[PDB]
């Protein structure tokens, strides 16, 4: 819930909401979509594959 005058929103870097069209507005959250690294388990190349 944002006071009905602001347009952008952020707490550290960016979490902006509200559609910036003068015709209409709609609160849309901003967040990544589960980025991450990948790790591989291997008992050893000279014992299995």
């Amino acid at each position: 819930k944002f006071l009905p005058f602001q347009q952008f929103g952020r707490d550290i870097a960016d979490t902006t909401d509200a559609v910036r069209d003068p015709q209409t507005l709609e609160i849309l959250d901003i967040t990544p979509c589960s980025f991450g690294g990948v790790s591989v388990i291997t008992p050893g190349t000279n014992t299995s594959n």
């Binding site: 550290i12 870097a13 967040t31 990544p32 991450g36 690294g37």
Partner: protein, 50 residues
């Protein structure tokens, strides 16, 4: 959750650490100091305190 930063959960979770501490307490109460230097040797606690 920010961009580019992630936190790795600890390998040894809370329950296992609690179990380790409980095992240490049980050993030091029911066996004195003999469990840290070989097999656990039972001994009554008043005798261990003396």
């Amino acid at each position: 959750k920010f961009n580019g930063l992630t936190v790795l959960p600890p390998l040894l979770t809370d329950e296992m650490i609690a179990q380790y501490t409980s095992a240490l307490l049980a050993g030091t109460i029911t066996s004195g100091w003999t469990f840290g230097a070989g097999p656990a040797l039972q001994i009554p606690f008043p005798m261990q305190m003396a």
